[PDB]
Design an enzyme around this catalytic site. Structure first.
Site, PDB file in Angstrom:
ATOM      1  N   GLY A  45      18.104 -37.698  27.547  1.00 25.45           N
ATOM      2  CA  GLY A  45      17.054 -38.401  26.827  1.00 25.45           C
ATOM      3  C   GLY A  45      16.124 -39.338  27.576  1.00 25.45           C
ATOM      4  O   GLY A  45      14.932 -39.397  27.268  1.00 25.45           O
ATOM      5  N   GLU A 100      16.572 -46.849  28.371  1.00 27.57           N
ATOM      6  CA  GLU A 100      16.962 -46.009  27.244  1.00 27.57           C
ATOM      7  C   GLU A 100      15.739 -45.354  26.617  1.00 27.57           C
ATOM      8  O   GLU A 100      14.628 -45.855  26.749  1.00 27.57           O
ATOM      9  CB  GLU A 100      17.686 -46.843  26.174  1.00 27.57           C
ATOM     10  CG  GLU A 100      19.202 -46.838  26.274  1.00 27.57           C
ATOM     11  CD  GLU A 100      19.797 -45.447  26.111  1.00 27.57           C
ATOM     12  OE1 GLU A 100      21.042 -45.324  26.144  1.00 27.57           O
ATOM     13  OE2 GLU A 100      19.026 -44.476  25.950  1.00 27.57           O
ATOM     14  N   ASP A 101      15.942 -44.224  25.946  1.00 21.93           N
ATOM     15  CA  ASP A 101      14.840 -43.557  25.272  1.00 21.93           C
ATOM     16  C   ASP A 101      14.698 -44.192  23.887  1.00 21.93           C
ATOM     17  O   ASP A 101      13.585 -44.411  23.403  1.00 21.93           O
ATOM     18  CB  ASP A 101      15.086 -42.039  25.168  1.00 21.93           C
ATOM     19  CG  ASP A 101      16.476 -41.683  24.643  1.00 21.93           C
ATOM     20  OD1 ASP A 101      17.348 -42.572  24.564  1.00 21.93           O
ATOM     21  OD2 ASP A 101      16.701 -40.493  24.321  1.00 21.93           O
ATOM     22  N   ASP A 104      19.183 -47.464  18.446  1.00 28.65           N
ATOM     23  CA  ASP A 104      19.319 -47.539  17.005  1.00 28.65           C
ATOM     24  C   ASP A 104      20.515 -48.424  16.629  1.00 28.65           C
ATOM     25  O   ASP A 104      20.338 -49.621  16.404  1.00 28.65           O
ATOM     26  CB  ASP A 104      19.407 -46.129  16.390  1.00 28.65           C
ATOM     27  CG  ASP A 104      20.306 -45.179  17.176  1.00 28.65           C
ATOM     28  OD1 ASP A 104      19.985 -43.966  17.197  1.00 28.65           O
ATOM     29  OD2 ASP A 104      21.329 -45.623  17.746  1.00 28.65           O
ATOM     30  N   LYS A 132      14.809 -48.755  16.737  1.00 31.80           N
ATOM     31  CA  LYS A 132      14.917 -48.759  15.282  1.00 31.80           C
ATOM     32  C   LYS A 132      15.679 -49.994  14.801  1.00 31.80           C
ATOM     33  O   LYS A 132      16.884 -49.927  14.538  1.00 31.80           O
ATOM     34  CB  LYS A 132      15.636 -47.506  14.792  1.00 31.80           C
ATOM     35  CG  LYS A 132      14.858 -46.234  14.976  1.00 31.80           C
ATOM     36  CD  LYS A 132      15.587 -45.088  14.314  1.00 31.80           C
ATOM     37  CE  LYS A 132      14.822 -43.792  14.466  1.00 31.80           C
ATOM     38  NZ  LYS A 132      15.516 -42.680  13.771  1.00 31.80           N
ATOM     39  N   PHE A 153      13.581 -38.867  11.444  1.00 31.16           N
ATOM     40  CA  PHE A 153      14.074 -37.949  12.472  1.00 31.16           C
ATOM     41  C   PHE A 153      12.956 -37.613  13.457  1.00 31.16           C
ATOM     42  O   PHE A 153      12.219 -36.643  13.262  1.00 31.16           O
ATOM     43  CB  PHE A 153      14.583 -36.659  11.832  1.00 31.16           C
ATOM     44  CG  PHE A 153      15.561 -35.902  12.688  1.00 31.16           C
ATOM     45  CD1 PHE A 153      16.888 -36.323  12.791  1.00 31.16           C
ATOM     46  CD2 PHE A 153      15.158 -34.777  13.400  1.00 31.16           C
ATOM     47  CE1 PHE A 153      17.805 -35.626  13.584  1.00 31.16           C
ATOM     48  CE2 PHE A 153      16.066 -34.073  14.197  1.00 31.16           C
ATOM     49  CZ  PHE A 153      17.392 -34.503  14.290  1.00 31.16           C
ATOM     50  N   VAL A 154      12.847 -38.412  14.516  1.00 36.72           N
ATOM     51  CA  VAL A 154      11.814 -38.233  15.526  1.00 36.72           C
ATOM     52  C   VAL A 154      12.255 -37.459  16.774  1.00 36.72           C
ATOM     53  O   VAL A 154      13.436 -37.377  17.081  1.00 36.72           O
ATOM     54  CB  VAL A 154      11.241 -39.603  15.966  1.00 36.72           C
ATOM     55  CG1 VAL A 154      10.564 -40.281  14.791  1.00 36.72           C
ATOM     56  CG2 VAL A 154      12.341 -40.482  16.509  1.00 36.72           C
ATOM     57  N   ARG A 166      11.997 -32.026  23.877  1.00 35.92           N
ATOM     58  CA  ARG A 166      12.025 -33.083  24.876  1.00 35.92           C
ATOM     59  C   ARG A 166      10.699 -33.156  25.631  1.00 35.92           C
ATOM     60  O   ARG A 166      10.284 -34.234  26.068  1.00 35.92           O
ATOM     61  CB  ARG A 166      13.160 -32.856  25.884  1.00 35.92           C
ATOM     62  CG  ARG A 166      14.567 -32.980  25.323  1.00 35.92           C
ATOM     63  CD  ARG A 166      15.600 -32.777  26.435  1.00 35.92           C
ATOM     64  NE  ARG A 166      16.970 -32.680  25.933  1.00 35.92           N
ATOM     65  CZ  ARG A 166      17.661 -33.688  25.403  1.00 35.92           C
ATOM     66  NH1 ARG A 166      17.118 -34.898  25.300  1.00 35.92           N
ATOM     67  NH2 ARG A 166      18.899 -33.481  24.962  1.00 35.92           N
TER      68      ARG A 166
HETATM   69 MG   LIG Z   1      20.019 -42.776  24.999  1.00 41.05          MG
END
Ligand SMILES: [Mg+2]
Ligand SMILES: [Mg+2]
Ligand SMILES: [Mg+2]
Ligand SMILES: [Mg+2]
Lengths: 179, 179, 178, 178
Positions: A45, A100-101, A104, A132, A153-154, A166
């Site tokens: 990710g 991080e991508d 959450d 998030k 849901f992205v 991706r």
């Molecule tokens: Mg991650």
């Protein structure tokens, strides 16, 4: 067309994304002039964000990765993960930035932070492109954030679904007919 | 300044690099419309090229990585390497494209190709951004190449030296006073 | 006790111990003068590897492989993902794959083909247990311990949901457990 | 023979065998009713893990760790890079780290702190050999086999350039080899 056809909505546009990555890059460059900066991202990710961010940081930095896995159902309650690929660079006494991508719940992130702290970096900060706030389930301090978004849901710019999307240059919401 | 100060020469410029990545992206997009495309890159060197190339490919593709190591001195004569991080995606029956940052002797690459062929992909092709024709020591067919270059100690866009310079937006030659 | 889950014992601790000694003697004779490297697949081969390596009076090296399944590829052609590669350079060396049990032999055939690509001087296979009627691959076993029926066996490395690996004998698990 | 490289035997095969049985009995009593998971560090702990797990009459699980050195961090504070993590979820479980030998105890202290972060119900340490005069870390050993002088010992898992792991006894290597 093709993958962009499956996208039902575009939360963050291509150019919108580019400008922010550039912005974060300037902030990091300044806060870390002088300091041994090491960027650690969690595969897969974070490759997209890592690639763009490091190019937007005019500093002598090192990059390394971590591949983790789930212990089944101990990962969802504690965020405990199995290390498939540990990082090779010795981070003791170095300034580490976790890339991080998306953040959450933050369970797995809080756990990795603790594990990385046990290796004695001189400092450890966290950076995300997506976040998030709703989602949060653990106490984690994000030192650098990109955008705050609703729990939809992205996918795109690293984020995926069944290993797909991706490579999208933007952050979109997949049509609920695909998941 | 900073890292760009240590650069003694610029073989491939930022814009020069961007246009070629875009070019290769169009060729791949066309040759793989319809086909299960999976891009495998070898960490860490290929992250920069992987990130740009996949975004330049308007196709539904999957990405995965491989982390390898040396068996000491059997790697330099045969190209035999130890798999630290194997790929997770099952490539049997899929169209695999190996993404490299640079191909010189090609020993390790020829070996990985053979190992990946044993997993039965429907097809296996190789793509590099950089290539040192002189260097070649093994029979490897590069299906997609970016630039041919002289055997000089280059860095940038993934390539490094002591883990540094991976974030340079161009391909330059380091001053011989640093190595 | 772990032993109360067994329907019947097939091979006693003394049978295993004696068979292991016997195999050790054969290998000692056959590999005298060679550069022997024993490679077992975790975690099943652990007990056997331990007893066998001790029964071989030769200057050998030991290493291990940890593999995983891909899903379909694994079940169809025995293709596996490696989680832990061997560290020793097996080039020009006499390698002996040590296994706990060979039934279908799919995964084994794949690993043998994979290790051959690393140029050992020679590559052979050694298993303590063997289920012939279950073969699915044209694999050759150079050193074999016992041939057994197609029964759910545990002990001496073989497990069931991670349990029973520590029994000193090979026994059949009672059906009320699977 | 591999045995001709030894200057003197310190512990015989029968001593090890008996000590392993003894430890197995203690652990059986102490862990009766618990969820025991044995974790050894590859490759040294292999022989001991094998004999010990067989001497414990309890329904245990077995797993392994493969670690590596970072360079300075490892030597200074015993920090290591993990090459192979354990697969079993040790949360709420009674874990027992099985080691071949503890001298400085640096790496061990780090691994214990690391596994504690995964929330085992309890975590203890078991070693077959121990060099007290060489400690460098405040580590507590719950089950110990033998205390030995600071000598270059091989056998029963301990190696030297990968050799001698297969000797059934603990011996001192002849100085003309290091
Ligand atoms: Mg991650
Ligand atoms: Mg490469
Ligand atoms: Mg097996
Ligand atoms: Mg040890």
């Amino acid at each position: 067309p093709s993958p962009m056809e499956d996208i039902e909505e575009i939360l963050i546009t291509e150019e919108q994304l580019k400008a922010k990555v550039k912005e974060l890059g300037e902030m990091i460059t300044r806060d870390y002039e002088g300091k041994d900066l090491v960027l650690i991202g969690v595969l897969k990710g974070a490759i997209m964000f890592m690639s763009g961010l490091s190019r937007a940081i005019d500093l002598p930095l090192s990059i390394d990765f971590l591949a983790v896995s789930s212990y089944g159902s101990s990962t969802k309650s504690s965020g405990i993960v199995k290390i498939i690929k540990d990082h090779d660079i010795d981070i003791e006494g170095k300034d580490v930035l976790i890339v991080e991508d998306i953040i959450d719940s933050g369970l797995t992130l809080a756990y990795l932070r603790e594990t990385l702290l046990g290796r004695k970096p001189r400092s450890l900060k966290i950076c995300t492109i997506l976040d998030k706030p709703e989602r949060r389930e653990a106490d984690v301090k994000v030192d650098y954030c990109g955008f705050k978004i609703p729990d939809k849901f992205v996918v795109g710019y690293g984020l995926d679904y069944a290993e797909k999307y991706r490579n999208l240059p933007f952050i979109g919401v997949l049509k609920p007919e695909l998941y």
